[PDB]
Structures are given as structure tokens and as C-alpha cells.
């Protein structure tokens, strides 16, 4: 609509991207609030003009939600 036009098809919304951040929840990316830190959720941002912001062959949505491989360590989960 007004603030949901993802340029690159990283399947993630640019308002949730350049701003304070986002966090997955039930396999769906939602806005970030500061009270999520008690439960164990992180906060990360990315580049809204690309679909691979680190060069590695996994996209931003595929790397935030851990649906890529179960052997890659969780230290390489934020994009």
C-alpha cells in the first residue's frame, strides 16, 4: 500500500527494513518492539535494494527464518 512496496523480492517489507528493524514470528516478519527482548527475540536490519545483502547464497527471509540448513550456526542467522 503506502508503506509496503518491497522493491527487491526479498519477501520482506521496506518499512520493517530500513527502520528500527523487524523480527519473525510464526514464520511471518512483523514490526519490532522493545519488550520482545525478555522472550528471546533479536533485532536486525538489512538492505532494501538487494535480495542478498551479504553475498552468501541465502536470501534475507531465508536466513532470518531458519529454513535453510540446521547445521549452520546461529551466529550467522542475522543477515
Amino acid at each position: 500500500w503506502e508503506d509496503e512496496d518491497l522493491d527487491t523480492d526479498n519477501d520482506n517489507i521496506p518499512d520493517s527494513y530500513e527502520r528500527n528493524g523487524y523480527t519473525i514470528k510464526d514464520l511471518i516478519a512483523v514490526k519490532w518492539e522493545d519488550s520482545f527482548a525478555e522472550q528471546g527475540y533479536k533485532k536486525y536490519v538489512s538492505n532494501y535494494l538487494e535480495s542478498n545483502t551479504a553475498g552468501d547464497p541465502y536470501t534475507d527471509y531465508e536466513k532470518a527464518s531458519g529454513s535453510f540448513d540446521k547445521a549452520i550456526k546461529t551466529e550467522a542467522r542475522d543477515p
Binding site: G55, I72, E75
Partner: protein
């Protein structure tokens, strides 16, 4: 030659095929690319091929189909015969990675790692930690401030080491599994160019901490945790008790309040450290009158040096000694002085 592999980093690698390079004395005997015999099917991160309980892996062939054992002529045989040894290097490694289909089966067919290497290296900066049981090396991206269209979230180096390894903000500082990492509690090592960039970009900051400088494009940073540490409130891992100590306002920095005189002496036997190495002894400053740092280590430099504060601001000092070989001798550090 009997070799085994290892892997440090975040992702695994399937069908690993290293290429090795043998040198003897200036020369280069052969370049071997590992065949189907010396191939490796899996490498989980932080593990080896083979595992910890097995013998190493032998290479002796050089063809595509393994025949034609590796030759050595007569002068190189007489050089290798008369005491010498050859050195082995690794040039490149090709492998595979795993993509899954639409909730189907993971395939690994021509998904080669070797074309994502020069793209990742020209974006990222490299940070390597070295503790005394394992090592880690990570790659973190960084912004290029020349191109105004180039968008990515910029980040400070104290945030890059926060994000790369899994660290938690325990009481302001960050701790890596009951090991303290700070600016003032580790050893920071750069090469020349990045040290030049860091010392050039300190003079624009209000706070003169190096964890607040901006991460750049081509950098290389190594850190080393110390082996013995003297934090005073907690965390003083020592078999040898320190002598002539003081206990008042001793939590961290910004609270130095004890002016005392005399000497401080520690003696550790050789059964608690390794021989034939090059240790480094380092600390910070104060505003006292005078001090001296005597080392009483034999087979080494048992001289002292002067303290000589240039100011009251915290500017570190560092010196080095040389260890004996597992004798009855003890390292004896004494620090004499008037003022702190």
C-alpha cells in the same frame, strides 16, 4: 604425507577437495589436487576429517586416476636425507553447499562455493578471535561511503564483534561464555594499513575508545584472550597468589583510589605454562611518582625498565620475557615503586 583437515567458520562444506603444495628448501616439489580416495564427504563446523579418535589420512598419488607415485631426484633425496624437512601449504579449496527445493529434498549438484568467494571478500571485513583451545574467523559486511546510492546499515566495530560471535551485554560489557572481551581486557592485533586507518580516525571522536570507530571496507582484525588475568573484584585466575595487594574501590576502571608504595612479587613454577615461547606482559598506567619492573627469569632478559608516566591518562605499557624449559625455576616478577 599424512594430513588431516579442519574447519572453522559458520557453514559446513560437502565434497571437500583441497590442493596442497610441497616445498623443501626454496624449491617446490609438487602441487597435488586430492583425488576420489582423499576426498571428504562432510565437514560440520568446528570438526575435522576424520574425527578425533582416528588416524590421519595418507596421500601418495598425483594422477587423476591414482597411479604414478610422487618422485624425488637424487639431490633432493640427499638434502632430505641429511636432517631437513619439507613444508606443506594449502592454496585453494573447492567444495559444495546445499540448497533445498520447495519443501522437498536437499540437492547438492554443481552448487559450488567457489564463485561466491571473490564477491564476499570484496564486501566484508575479517575478524578473527584466538583463544587457547580453538579459533574463530568471521566475515562482517561494511558500508562504502563513497557511493551515495550504496545503501546498507553502517555499524561500529564494537557492534560488529557483538554481532559476529554470540556475545551478551552483561553489565555494559560483553562476555563470551565466561570470558571477558573488552577494549582493555584483551590483546588487539592489526596489520599496518588498518592500524593506520584506526589511528587516523580516532581524532574525530569525542570519546577516545576504539570500539566506537567506524568499520571500513578492507580491514583485518585479530584478537587474543590473555592466559592470566588480574581483575580485582572477581575473575583472577591464578595458582600463585599476588603479594602486597590493596582492596578499595576495585570494581573496574574510573575508580583508582589506592596510592601505596613498596614492591609486588609473583612467582610461578614452569609446570603451569608451556616452554620455548614468547609471552607478553602488559598493563595500564596511573599518576604515581616512580616504579620499576624487574623480571628474574633465567635463560632470558632479567633486566628491568623504568615506568615514566607522560601524563595521568590511562596509556598502556607492554613488555616481554622468555620462558625456560620445564625446570625447577620459577618466573619471578617484581615491581618496585613509590606511588601506586
Amino acid at each position: 604425507a599424512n594430513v588431516r583437515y579442519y574447519n572453522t567458520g559458520t557453514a559446513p562444506m560437502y565434497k571437500v577437495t583441497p590442493t596442497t603444495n610441497l616445498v623443501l628448501d626454496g624449491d617446490t616439489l609438487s602441487t597435488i589436487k586430492a583425488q576420489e580416495n582423499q576426498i571428504g564427504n562432510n565437514l560440520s563446523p568446528g570438526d575435522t576429517y576424520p574425527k578425533k579418535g582416528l588416524s590421519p589420512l595418507a596421500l601418495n598419488t598425483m594422477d587423476q586416476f591414482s597411479s604414478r607415485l610422487i618422485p624425488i631426484n637424487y639431490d633432493q633425496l640427499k638434502k632430505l636425507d641429511a636432517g631437513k624437512q619439507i613444508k606443506l601449504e594449502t592454496t585453494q579449496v573447492s567444495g559444495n553447499f546445499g540448497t533445498k527445493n520447495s519443501s522437498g529434498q536437499i540437492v547438492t549438484e554443481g552448487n559450488s562455493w567457489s564463485d561466491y568467494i571473490s564477491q564476499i571478500d570484496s564486501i566484508s571485513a575479517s575478524i578473527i578471535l584466538d583463544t587457547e583451545n580453538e579459533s574463530y574467523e568471521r566475515r562482517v559486511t561494511a558500508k562504502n561511503l563513497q557511493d551515495p546510492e550504496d545503501k546498507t546499515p553502517e555499524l561500529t566495530i564494537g557492534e560488529a564483534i557483538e554481532k559476529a560471535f554470540g556475545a551478551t551485554k552483561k553489565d555494559g560489557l560483553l562476555y563470551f561464555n565466561d570470558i571477558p572481551i573488552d577494549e582493555s581486557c584483551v590483546e588487539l592485533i592489526f596489520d599496518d594499513n588498518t592500524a593506520n586507518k584506526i589511528k587516523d580516525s580516532l581524532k574525530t571522536l569525542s570519546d577516545k575508545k576504539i570500539y566506537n570507530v567506524k568499520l571500513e571496507r578492507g580491514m583485518n582484525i585479530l584478537i587474543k584472550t590473555p592466559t592470566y588475568f588480574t581483575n580485582f573484584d572477581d575473575y583472577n585466575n591464578y595458582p600463585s597468589t599476588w603479594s602486597n595487594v590493596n582492596t578499595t574501590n576495585q570494581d573496574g576502571l574510573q575508580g583508582s583510589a589506592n596510592k601505596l608504595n613498596g614492591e609486588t612479587k609473583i612467582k610461578i613454577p614452569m609446570s603451569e605454562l608451556k616452554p620455548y615461547k614468547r609471552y607478553v606482559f602488559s598493563g595500564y598506567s596511573k599518576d604515581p611518582l616512580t616504579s620499576n619492573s624487574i623480571i628474574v627469569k633465567i635463560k632470558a632478559k632479567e633486566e628491568k625498565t623504568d615506568y615514566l608516566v607522560p601524563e595521568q591518562g590511562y596509556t598502556k605499557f607492554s613488555y616481554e620475557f622468555e620462558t625456560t624449559e620445564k625446570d625447577s625455576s620459577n618466573i619471578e616478577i617484581t615491581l618496585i615503586g613509590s606511588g601506586t
